[PDB]
Amino acid sequence: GKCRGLRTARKLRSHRRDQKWHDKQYKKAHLGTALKANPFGGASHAKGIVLEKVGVEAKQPNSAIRKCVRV
Amino acid sequence: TKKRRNNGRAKKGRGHVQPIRCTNCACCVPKDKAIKKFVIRNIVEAAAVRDISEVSVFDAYVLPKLYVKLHYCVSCAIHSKVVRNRSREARKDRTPPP
Amino acid sequence: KEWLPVTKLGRLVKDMKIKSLEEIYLFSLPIKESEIIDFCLGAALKDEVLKIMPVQKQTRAGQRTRFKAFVAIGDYNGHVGLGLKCSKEVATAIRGAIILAKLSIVPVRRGYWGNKIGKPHTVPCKVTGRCGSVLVRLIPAPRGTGIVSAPVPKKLLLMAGIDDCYTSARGCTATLGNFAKATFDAISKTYSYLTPDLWKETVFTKSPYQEFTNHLMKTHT
Amino acid sequence: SGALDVLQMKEEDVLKFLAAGTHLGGTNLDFQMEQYIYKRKSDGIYIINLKRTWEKLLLAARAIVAIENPADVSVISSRNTGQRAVLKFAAATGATPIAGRFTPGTFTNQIQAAFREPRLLVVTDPQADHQPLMEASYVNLPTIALCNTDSPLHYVDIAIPCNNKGAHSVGLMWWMLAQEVLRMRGTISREHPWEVMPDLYFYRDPEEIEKEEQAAA
Amino acid sequence: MRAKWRKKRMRRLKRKRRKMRQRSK
Amino acid sequence: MQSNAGEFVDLYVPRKCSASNRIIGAKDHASIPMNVAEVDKVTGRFNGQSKTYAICGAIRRMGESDDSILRLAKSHGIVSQNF
Amino acid sequence: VRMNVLADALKSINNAEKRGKRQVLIRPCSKVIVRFLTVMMKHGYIGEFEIIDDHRAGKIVVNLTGRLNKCGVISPRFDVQLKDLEKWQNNLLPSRQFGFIVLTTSAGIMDHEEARRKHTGGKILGFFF
Amino acid sequence: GRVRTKTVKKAARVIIEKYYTRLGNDFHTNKRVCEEIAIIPSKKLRNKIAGYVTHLMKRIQRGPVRGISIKLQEEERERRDNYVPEVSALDQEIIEVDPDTKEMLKLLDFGSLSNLQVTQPTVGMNFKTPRG
RNA sequence: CGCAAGACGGACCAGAGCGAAAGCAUUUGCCAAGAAUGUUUUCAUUAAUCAAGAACGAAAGUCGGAGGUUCGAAGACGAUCAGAUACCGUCGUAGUUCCGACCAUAAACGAUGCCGACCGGCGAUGCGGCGGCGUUAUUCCCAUGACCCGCCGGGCAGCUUCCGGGAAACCAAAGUCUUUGGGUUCCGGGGGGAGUAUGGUUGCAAAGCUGAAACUUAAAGGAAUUGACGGAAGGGCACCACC
C-alpha cells in the first residue's frame, strides 16, 4: 500500500475495489458480459444438434485436418 | 536506452532554448544541442601568402583573418567528419582534442 | 594421490597440525586448494549436480555449445558449498564444479525455535540472501517441520544439516543459477549475523600463520 | 610509542625532516588525512604535523617487529623515487622487496612462480602502489602506507603522512622506518646513531651519476 | 504503419462514422 | 550459544571487528587481525607479547581502518595521548 | 514535513549503524524517543546518550555500539491486544530468541516480553533486533 | 624479415641465465657452447639461438636486460649495496623554515633550534593554474 | 547611395540565470511580482499532500479585425526515377506577425509526483552573506567594485567510489527494502482488439476528457551479450589489389 494513515480504511478498501476491475479474471466474473456471451451460459456440459460435420485446418507448422462438428 | 547522461545537449535547468538553422542543412537544431566551431582562418591556406605579400603596396602588411562561427547539426557534423562515433566509455570525455 | 600443497595454509593441512577448518573460517583465510576440504570433510561430503545447463555463443559459422554444471556439496551437519563450472565437455564441467563447490564451502550457523532443548535443528534467525531478482528468505521452523521450500534449496538445506526450515522465495526462481546462489547467500549470512548472544567480546587467539611460522621456515624452500 | 622518552621524537630527526621536506606536503588535501596536518601554508602547501608524522611511523615500525619471520613483510615500490629505498630496507630489516613492476595476481594466483604470501605490506604511495592494496583485499594482508596529503587511505591500515613526491623525503622516511624496526628486535642500541648513513636510501639520478664522476674526477 | 498515422487513420475513420450516423438522425 | 543444559553447541564462534563491533564473515578476506608490538618501558624493545586488533573488510574499503587503529592504539596507550 | 518525530530519530540512528558512526545525533526530541532509547539501553543494543537542551525541541547524541542490526518504526500506531501481540512478534522480529517490539501501554512505554508479564496491550511504536 | 620467434628468444634468456660464464662476444665460440650445454635438434635453429645470444651478450657487456636474472646481477646488487657519499645534504646549518612551520615547531618541544634560518611570507598568493 | 516595409534580436551565449510549467535575450523608462541570503523583528501551528472545483499552458488549428518582408502545408512547374502525385530547384495558398476571443494537446521528458529526514568525498560555478595578506581603479584617504584565499546558506550542474540499490544500463538517488510501515496524491495488472464502440460532457469546428465488450493470441517486451550485416568512423594487408 501507499497511504498508511490509521483512519484510511474506506480509501484503501475502495481504491482496491476500483483497481480490482483492471484485473482481467475479476472483470470476466463480475461484469455479466462474459457470462452473457459464454455459449453454454455457465454449464460444464451442453446437449445440441449436429447440423454439419466440418473439417478444420490445423494452424501453424502442424499441417493437418482437425475433424470437428458444428453443433 | 538512455545513451547519454545529458540529453546530447547543454540544457540542465532551462525548459526551452532558441533554435539555430544549420550551415550545411537549414535544420532547426537547438543552440546548446548544436555542434559549434568558431573557425578563425587566414584568407589563403598556405601556397598564396607568398605572392599576395610580394605584390602588396605596404611593407610587411599583415592580412585580415576570417572570423565565422559554424553551427553543424548532428547529421551534418558526422557526414563532414567534424564529430565522430567514440567508444561507449570515451563518449564521456568532454575534452576538446589537440 | 599426493597433493603436495602450494599455498601457506595448505602446507599445515597436509601435516595433520591444523585439525579443524573452523580454525580456517575464524581468520577468514582464502581456501584456494581443492584438497583442504577433501582432507577434513573427506568421508562425509556428498556431491549432487543441481542442473547441466548448455550455454551457447553464436560465432562466425555455427554455435559453440559449452556446458554449465551447478554442484551443491555438504556433509549432513554444518558445511555447504555451491560451485559453478562452464566447460566444453560435460564430464569435466561436472568434475570442475565439485572442486569449485569445495573452495567456497561455508559453515552454517544453526539455532533454535522457541525452546533451546537438544541439538540445533533450524536457522538461528531470519536471513535473506539474493543475486539477480531471486530473493530467498530463510525462516526458523519448530522441530519435525522439515525444509518447507522448493526442491532445489531443500537439496542445499538437506546438505546444510538444517532439518526444519521455512522459506519465502521471490523472483525468476526458474533460473537455477540465481536461485541456488540466493539460498546459498542466505546460509552464508547465518554466521555473519550478530545476535545478542554474541555481544560477549572476541578474544583474539593466534592465527595459524602467526603460531607455526617457525615450521613455515624449515619444511620447504 | 606514547609516554616513553625512549621512543619520543628525537632532536636530531627534526633537522632531517626540515632539510628533506617531509613537512612540505602537496597542493590538494584528502579528507581522510586532515588529522595528520597542522596547518595549510600560503602558496598551497599542507604542513604535515611532524609529531603525528613521527607517532604513526612508530606504530608502523611496531607492526613490522610483531612479525616473527622478518622475511614475509612484502615491501613494494613501483615509482623510481623509492625503488632503491625498499631494496635496502629489505636488506636491513630482512623483508621481501618488489622494486618496480608489481605483477597483478602475485598474492592471488597460485600457479604463478611469483606467488609470495606475505603477512604485512609497506607501500611507498597508495596510488603508485594501487595494485598491492587490491591484492591485499583478496588474501588477508594488513598495510603500512607512506601516505601523502592527497594520497587516499583506501585499503591501508596504518597511514604514515609523508612527502613521498619529493626525492630526498622518501629515503629519509624509509631511514626512520628501517632504524626504528631494527632497534626493537635488539640489533641497534639507542646509544650510538646507526652505522648506515641516511643518504644510502636515495634513488640516484643517472644524470647525476654521469655528473658525480665528472664532479669527483 | 507508424503509430502517428495509425492515429490519423482512426481520426478519419471516426469522422466517417459521425458522417454516417447523421444519415439516420 | 548454549543448549538447555548450558553446554556450548555451535561449531565455531566467529571473530568481531574491534572498531565497528560487526562480526567478521567466514569469507570476508579484507578482514585482518593486525598484531602491534609491545615495548619494554625503558629498554625500548619488543617484549615478545603483542596488541591484536580486528578491523572488518567494509572499514578498509571505506578507508577508515587507519583512523580506527590511531584511535584504538590510543586506548591501549601505544600512541601518545597528546598526539 | 516532519509528521512522525520518532520515525526520523530511529532512521537517523539506523543509517549510522549501517554506515558505522561511533555516535549519532537526532534533531527533535519527543519523550517517546527517550522512552524508546531507554528500552534500547536497558536491553543494551545502544550505549548511554545525553540530551542537548536548546529552548526548543531537544537534541540527542546517542553513543552507538555495533550491536543494533535494525531500528524500526511501525507508522501508523496500530492498537494491539495480547492475542495479536503474538502475530506482531512472529513476522516483525527475526526469531522467538531475541529482538524486542517496544509498544506504548497505559503502564508506560515498554517491550513486548514485559507486556506478556504486566498483562497490558497498547499502540505499537516500532522494533529493534 | 629477420624477427626472432619465442622459441629463439626463450633459449636466448635461459642459456644466459644458466651458462653466462661459458658464453662470450664471438658467435662461433658460443655457437659451439650451445651443442654441449643444450640438445638442439636442428642445425639452423642453433644459429638462430646463438645469434640473438651474442646480441644479448653484447648488451650484458653494457648494463641491465629485462628478461635475464643471473648470479652476476646479484653481485651488482651486492656492489651497489656499498655506495658511500660525503657528509649529507640533510646536515646543513642554513635550513629554510617558514613562519607557519616555525609556529608548529613552537607547539612541539623543539621551539627554537641552533641551526635554522626563519624567513618572511611570500605575499601575492597566486598558486592555481587557471581554468581552460 | 538614399528610401519604405514587416519580421528577427547573431557573435557576446555558457551543461550560466530566472519562471509553476509552457516559456524568456537590442536601449531606456514605467508598473506590479518573486526567490535566495541577512535578521538577538513579528504572529505562534497558521502546516504537508490533495477527490470535486479552478488558473496558466509551445506548436499547429478555428473565428473576426489589421498586416503581409522572409519563410511556406495545400497547390503550379522543372528535375530524379520504371514510377515520385517524394527527397532536390524556382514560385506560391493557408499560415508564419500583431489585436481580441477559442482550443487544452506534445518524446508538455529528467520518459523520474510533491513535503520531510538521514546517509561519502572531490574540484568548479550562480546568488546573497561573513571574514582574510596582498594586486588594482576612483588618487587626495575611506568605503565600494575588479580579482586573490576560504567559510556558511540556497540553486543548476559536474567528477569520483564496493554508501547501497537494481534485470542491468545506470543511480548520492532510481539509496536508507523479506532486516518489508515518514506523510500523501495520481496511477499500472500478458500482447492485441483500443484509446476503439457506446453514453455523457466540452468546443464554432478540428477535436479533448471520461470509456468498455465480443473476440483474438503464446507471447509482445526491458537491459545486456555474442555473432552476422551496414550505402557508419577508422586501422591494416595482398601484383589471385592498384601504382
Numbering used by the authors:
A (entry chain Y): 2 to 72
B (entry chain b): 2 to 99
C (entry chain D): 58 to 278
D (entry chain B): 2 to 218
E (entry chain An): 1 to 25
F (entry chain W): 1 to 83
G (entry chain X): 2 to 130
H (entry chain S): 2 to 133
Sentences from the paper on this structure:
Colony collapse disorder (CCD) is a multi‐faceted syndrome decimating bee populations worldwide, and a group of viruses of the widely distributed Dicistroviridae family have been identified as a causing agent of CCD. This family of viruses employs non‐coding RNA sequences, called internal ribosomal entry sites (IRESs), to precisely exploit the host machinery for viral protein production. The IAPV‐IRES found in the intergenic region of the IAPV virus belongs to the well‐characterized type IV family of viral IRESs. IRES sequences from this group dispense with all canonical initiation factors and are able to assemble by themselves an elongation competent ribosome, successfully redirecting the cellular machinery for viral protein production by an RNA‐only mechanism. Using cryo‐EM, we comprehensively characterized how the intergenic IRES of IAPV, a virus of the Dicistrovirideae family and a causing agent of the colony collapse disorder (CCD), binds and manipulates ribosomes to redirect them toward the production of viral proteins.
The binary IAPV‐IRES/80S complex populates three major conformations, with limited differences between them. Class 1 is unrotated, while classes 2 and 3 exhibit a small rotational movement of the 40S. No populations with wide rotations of the small subunit were identified in our large 80S/IAPV‐IRES dataset. This suggests that, in contrast with Cripavirus IRESs (Fernandez et al, 2014; Koh et al, 2014), the IAPV‐IRES is able to restrict the dynamics of the small subunit, channeling it toward a canonical, non‐rotated configuration. In such position, the PKI of the IAPV‐IRES establishes a network of interactions with both the large and the small subunits, effectively restricting the rotation of the 40S. Apart from the interactions established by the apical loop of the SL‐III with ribosomal protein uL16, the decoding event elicited by the placement of the PKI in the decoding center allows the establishment of an interaction with the 28S rRNA base A3760 (A1913 in E. coli), normally involved in decoding (Demeshkina et al, 2010). This interaction is maintained along the small fluctuations of the 40S, which, locally, are restricted to displacements of a few Angströms. The limited dynamics of 40S subunit rotation observed in our large cryo‐EM dataset reflects a solid anchoring of both ribosomal subunits, mediated mainly by the additional contacts contributed by the SL‐III characteristic of Aparavirus IRESs.
